[PDB]
Structure formats: structure tokens, C-alpha cells
């Protein structure tokens, strides 16, 4: 039965944790909006081998996930859960969190994402050979851009993306349920205080993030079966652990 002061202290703790682990400051991403890949640079990316483009993207994704791991480490209540449950939650939620975080680096006006120093369209990623997945991820970021999340809202929402008591394999489900509820109280309190409860009905359907993650695992299966040695030799060990079957 967390008190109002405890709920308020949770809001602050979650928001602080996100600030410390956000990977790139929002202002930096916004400042870079006019730095867009040229037609020649786009073509250069498109003409990369499938293996090199997958390898680059796997490294960048691993980097982004490492920040999400640090977010969880600092998240009030997460370290209180048993070791098994920490693992279950991060293994399922890490990628979901990255997909939400991406909207900050997404410019809806020209439908570009910040990638390797400049903004580029989904055409940048053609060499991967998973255009449907990329389009679905860009559609997802475009949908989130319409919500106009503040930094604090992203912090509170990504905490809830991670603390999801519906994941199978939890040893202490009721403990996770209790933390989830308190984080829900923290989110809703912050939203009520800022007149932003209207966003709740517009948040992605919960099956959405799961679906994007399954699609990503499936596209890696297609790539890995075609280039198994490249993945074994060159891909980050954390990436394989999280995503390979």
C-alpha cells in the first residue's frame, strides 16, 4: 500500500534513472534534424552487403540495449525482484524499450531516423532485406511521434514496458504485479498532475510491441540461416543471447 509520498518519490526515481541512461540527450537529437543523409550516402548504404549491414545494426542495437540494462539496474524496485525474474523481464522487454526510445530519434516531418551521425529514411536499411519489418518499425515510431511524449512520460512509460507481470517464466509473479501496479500509480499520478491522462487511450495496443519483437526474431532467423558464420564470429554475444534461436 504505497503512500502518496512513496508514489511521488517513485516518479522522481524513474525519471532520474531515465535521464542518467537515455543514451542521447533529446536536444542533441533535435539539433541534428537538418543533418540528413545525401542521395549518394543513401545509395552507399543500400549497396553494402547484407552481412555488413546486419553486423552494423546488431552492434548499434546491442549498444542501445546496454543503456536499457543500465536503466533497469537503476530502476526503483527492479533490483528487489529475484534474479530469475530480472532476467525474464529484461530478455523480453529490452527490445520493446529500444523501440519506444526510437521515437525520440525519429523525425515525423520527413520520416527519418538518426543513424550513424545523420538522419535517414527507411530506404537506408534496404541491404538488410527485411523491408516489412523496417516499415513496421517506422510506422510504430510515426504513431508514437503523434503522442508528443515528454522525457518524463517516456521514462514512466518505458518503466512499465519493462515491468510487465504477464511475461511467462516468472518465479515471483505477485512481486512483479505489485511493482507494476505502483509504477502504474506513478505514471497515472504524473499524468493527472500535468493534465496528460488523455494519452492513455492512445498508447499502443499491448500486442503491438510483442509482435514487432517476434518479427525481429523471425527476420534474424532468416539472416542467421543464410549467414551463420558471420553471426557466430562477429555479432555481440548479448545480441545472440537475446535474439537468436
Amino acid at each position: 500500500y504505497a503512500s502518496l509520498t512513496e508514489i511521488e518519490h517513485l516518479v522522481q526515481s524513474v525519471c532520474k534513472s531515465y535521464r542518467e541512461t537515455c543514451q542521447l540527450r533529446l536536444e542533441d537529437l533535435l539539433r541534428q534534424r537538418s543533418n540528413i543523409f545525401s542521395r549518394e550516402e543513401v545509395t552507399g548504404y543500400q549497396r553494402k552487403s547484407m552481412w555488413e549491414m546486419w553486423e552494423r545494426c546488431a552492434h548499434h542495437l546491442t549498444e542501445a540495449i546496454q543503456y536499457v540494462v543500465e536503466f533497469a539496474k537503476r530502476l526503483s524496485g527492479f533490483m528487489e525482484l529475484c534474479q530469475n525474474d530480472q532476467i525474464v523481464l529484461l530478455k523480453a522487454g529490452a527490445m520493446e524499450v529500444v523501440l519506444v526510445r526510437m521515437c525520440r530519434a525519429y523525425n515525423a516531418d520527413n520520416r527519418t531516423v538518426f543513424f550513424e551521425g545523420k538522419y535517414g529514411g527507411m530506404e537506408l536499411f534496404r541491404a538488410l532485406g527485411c523491408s516489412e519489418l523496417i516499415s513496421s518499425i517506422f510506422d510504430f515510431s510515426h504513431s508514437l511521434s503523434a503522442l508528443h511524449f515528454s522525457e518524463d512520460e517516456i521514462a514512466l512509460y518505458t518503466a512499465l514496458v519493462l515491468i510487465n507481470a504477464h511475461r511467462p517464466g516468472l518465479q515471483e509473479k505477485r512481486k512483479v504485479e505489485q511493482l507494476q501496479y505502483n509504477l502504474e500509480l506513478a505514471f497515472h499520478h504524473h499524468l493527472s498532475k500535468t493534465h496528460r491522462q488523455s494519452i492513455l487511450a492512445k498508447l499502443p495496443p499491448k500486442g503491438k510491441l510483442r509482435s514487432l519483437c517476434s518479427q525481429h526474431v523471425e527476420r534474424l532467423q532468416i539472416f542467421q540461416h543464410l549467414h551463420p558464420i558471420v553471426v557466430q564470429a562477429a555479432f555481440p554475444p548479448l545480441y545472440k543471447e537475446l535474439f537468436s534461436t
Binding site: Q66, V69, A72, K73, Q83, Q86, I87, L90, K91, P237, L238, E241, L242
Partner: peptide
Amino acid sequence: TLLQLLLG
């Protein structure tokens, strides 16, 4: 696991 290591 690696997640275990990264978490301590």
C-alpha cells in the same frame, strides 16, 4: 548468462 553478469 550475460544479462546475469551485466546485472551483478
